[PDB]
Design a protein around this ligand. Structure first.
Ligand SMILES: OC[C@H]1O[C@H](O[C@H]2[C@@H](O)[C@H](O)[C@@H](CO)O[C@H]2O)[C@@H](O)[C@@H](O)[C@@H]1O
Ligand SMILES: [Ca+2]
Ligand code: NA
Length: 712
């Protein structure tokens, strides 16, 4: 699909109480340092765009990854005509007709009805071009400069801005530089000025058209001017062509077709949201050397840096997809994440722009381990192992960094119930320990590999054979009483025992043994899927959107609206019964579409988009760090996958209509494939992946199972 037909209002119909993706209409280049979006309201906090709004407050320069993290280093540009007594966003706001507007990754185009202005914003990595067509005779641009700001007019054609605003930052004076070069001159001089919450009305007089070339920096005003100088000669049409080519570079790596073209539209909307995050957070100096801002030391440092990622979300799907088709990006992003460690002492958890420390676990360990077993940045793995061992053995004095209850986990083999979300912390630490083990193994550090492989079995500490759930446990080894299987929070993050008891990616075979048998585990999975989507709110004291999103649909406790349940259909693959989940996976993919209500829950910076892409192709990385993809049920009829190693994997299904809900047979390069998984190596060889599909199941009797520590 051509990038101009992607509508960025996909997944934007949200509020605090209910998510259909909690996406913004991000205009930008892939991994752009800034994104650009219309702002329709300043009265709904982080939810500053709604597709049903008919009000336009301005073009917002944003770094907002989610409404939960909020924004950093934002400002607005608002075309105006005539006098304005008061410069507030409300006083300057114009209605607009959404149905006559363009919302695309490479272009925003809309008409402010109040002013008879039509304007067009095209993005670049560090800036963009805003073209403004005026019908009236006293023509302006309003700059809204939140937080502490500085602004000056350098000449008739040049303005420079600095803003200090953020939701959370280690640097209380965290600064963003923004420069504007105008084709048509300013007709009113103003003196350099500074303040809080700036409202600056630039004047151009009676011109029909203004063209604003803008750029930006987290380094300096001088760096922002160099970023601009690199593209100042481009026309809007040339910058648009370049931005379309940048997106085509990534879109061309997954060319797919479907029986239903609605499914193809959904695919490419999700693919657009797979190459936004993490955002570029470095610039190239006068010598083309990567530099970035280090909020910890409050200085400019050398090297790459990336931002706007919660690894709790993105480790699931984004980095595994990059491992197949964007290895060059994965390689540079790992270098940034290590720089984050170099600068703070701990591998990053939630970057926006710097460590915000939200969500359980240090799932960055899975991004590292998956890369190690796939031979991505082997050069960095000794530095990563040292970083991982430090996180697994040393408690940070600052609450947002590394592991919580590190020392108690080492003493007890679990985080005790006195800690918040102890079950998640425990299971995330045991999976991290598997990940550390895998990195050690790739480096032939046998002693480290062995110790961490044993630590990875600590999930067994919270398994209650009496209930068949993971439950919180006190320092004397007693399960918290008054257990209710559907009670959310307290011991579990954003779920009940049902959304929390299966985070054992390292050893499903061992979790299955705790149940007693492949059959007793099967019974639990059937009960998880086939029950009503009931919840109890006591752990929170109120209903939260993740509960509402599960209870909105009839898929039992398989809460596809949130990351904890993402792997659930694949659990059937660990008892040799993948056929039980093939229909379920096609039914789950139908909860996605290209509309403003198009996701079942928070998209989270590529995480749920890449869930959809992988499942569309029919395989899924259950266990980052194992070098495998568990087989599911494809929705495509064809895919040409351009692998980073330069080979092509061509996928072909038999006719893949609604009634096709099972896999009959798979041939990989004309050889019957019976295993319920593919190795990463197998897919990297390229060739032909043929799925013969069925209207009834073809049960396999193969003993073959995906990776588990306890059986390797
Ligand atoms: O974007 C940050 C983080 O957001 C998630 O959780 C949000 C919100 O959805 C949830 O209701 C409350 C629970 O009190 O927590 C907020 O931080 C979370 O799903 C995660 O996916 C994401 O990284
Ligand atoms: Ca989420
Ligand atoms: Na939805």
């Amino acid at each position: 699909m051509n990038i101009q037909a992607i509508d960025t209002r996909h997944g934007t119909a949200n509020q605090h109480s209910f998510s259909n993706g909690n996406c913004l209409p991000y205009t930008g280049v892939p991994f752009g340092m800034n994104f650009y979006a219309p702002q329709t309201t300043d009265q709904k906090g982080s939810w500053w765009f709604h597709p049903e709004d008919r009000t336009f407050q301005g073009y917002r320069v944003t770094h907002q990854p989610s409404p939960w993290m909020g924004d950093f280093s934002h400002l607005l540009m608002t075309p105006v005509s005539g006098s304005l007594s008061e410069l507030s966003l409300f006083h300057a706001q114009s209605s607009y007709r959404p149905e006559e507007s363009l919302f695309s990754p490479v272009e925003i185009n809309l008409t402010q009805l109040r002013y008879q202005i039509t304007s067009q914003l095209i993005p670049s990595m560090y800036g963009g071009i805003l073209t403004i067509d005026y019908q009236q005779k006293d023509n302006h641009l309003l700059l809204t400069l939140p937080g502490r700001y500085q602004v000056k007019q350098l000449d008739d054609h040049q303005v420079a801005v600095k803003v200090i605003n953020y939701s959370g930052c280690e640097d209380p004076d965290f600064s963003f530089y923004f420069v504007l070069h105008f084709e048509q001159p300013l007709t009113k001089w103003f003196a350099p000025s500074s303040g809080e919450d700036g409202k600056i009305l630039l004047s151009f007089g009676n011109i029909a058209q203004q063209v604003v070339h803008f750029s930006s920096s987290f380094i300096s005003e001088k760096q922002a001017q160099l970023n601009l100088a690199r593209e100042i000669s481009l026309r809007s049409t040339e910058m648009l062509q370049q931005g379309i080519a940048d997106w085509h570079n990534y879109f061309d790596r997954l060319k797919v077709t479907h029986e239903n073209p609605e499914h193809t539209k959904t695919f490419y909307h999700t693919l657009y949201r797979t190459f936004l995050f993490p955002q570029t957070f470095y610039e190239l100096d006068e010598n083309q050397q990567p530099i970035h801002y280090d909020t910890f030391s409050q200085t400019v440092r050398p090297g790459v840096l990336y931002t706007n990622n919660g690894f709790w979300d993105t480790y699931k799907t984004v980095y595994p997809l990059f491992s197949l088709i964007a290895q060059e990006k994965y390689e540079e992003m790992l270098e940034g994440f290590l720089n984050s460690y170099n600068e703070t002492g701990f591998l990053p958890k939630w970057l926006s722009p710097d460590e915000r420390g939200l969500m359980p676990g240090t799932l960055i360990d899975a991004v590292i381990a998956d890369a190690a077993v796939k031979k991505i940045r082997p050069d960095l793995m000794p530095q990563f192992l040292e970083a991982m061992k430090k996180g697994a053995t040393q408690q940070s004095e600052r609450e947002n960094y590394g592991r919580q209850g590190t020392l108690d986990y080492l003493k007890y083999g679990y985080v005790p119930s006195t800690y918040h979300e102890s079950v998640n912390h425990t299971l995330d630490y045991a999976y991290s320990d598997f990940c550390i083990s895998q990195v050690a193994k790739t480096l032939n550090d046998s002693e480290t590999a062995t110790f961490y492989r044993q630590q990875a079995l600590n999930y067994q500490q919270l398994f209650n054979p009496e209930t068949g759930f993971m439950q919180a446990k006190d320092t004397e080894g007693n399960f918290r009483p008054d257990f209710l299987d559907i009670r959310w929070g307290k011991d579990y993050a954003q779920g009940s025992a049902w959304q929390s008891s299966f985070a054992v990616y390292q050893d499903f075979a061992g979790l299955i043994k705790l149940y007693g048998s492949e059959l007793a585990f099967e019974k639990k999975l059937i009960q998880l899927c086939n029950q009503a989507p009931n919840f109890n709110v006591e752990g929170y004291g109120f209903e939260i959107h993740e509960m509402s999103e599960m209870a909105a649909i009839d898929f039992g406790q398989l809460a596809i609206s949130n990351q904890p349940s993402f792997h659930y259909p694949f659990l059937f693959s660990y008892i040799g019964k993948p056929e039980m989940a093939q229909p379920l996976l096609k039914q789950l993919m139908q909860t996605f579409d290209a509309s403003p209500t198009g996701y079942p829950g928070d998209e989270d910076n590529g995480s749920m988009s890449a869930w959809y892409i992988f499942n569309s192709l029919g395989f899924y990385p259950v266990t980052p760090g194992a070098g495998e993809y568990v087989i599911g049920m494809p929705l495509v009829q064809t895919a040409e996958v351009k692998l980073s190693n330069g080979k092509q994997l061509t996928i072909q299904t038999s006719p893949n209509k609604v009634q096709q809900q099972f896999i009959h047979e798979i041939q990989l390069n004309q050889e019957k494939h019976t295993a319920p998984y593919f190795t990463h190596q197998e897919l990297l060889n390229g060739g032909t992946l043929d799925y013969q599909l069925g209207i009834v199941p073809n049960p396999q009797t193969t003993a073959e199972r995906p990776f588990s520590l306890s059986t390797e």
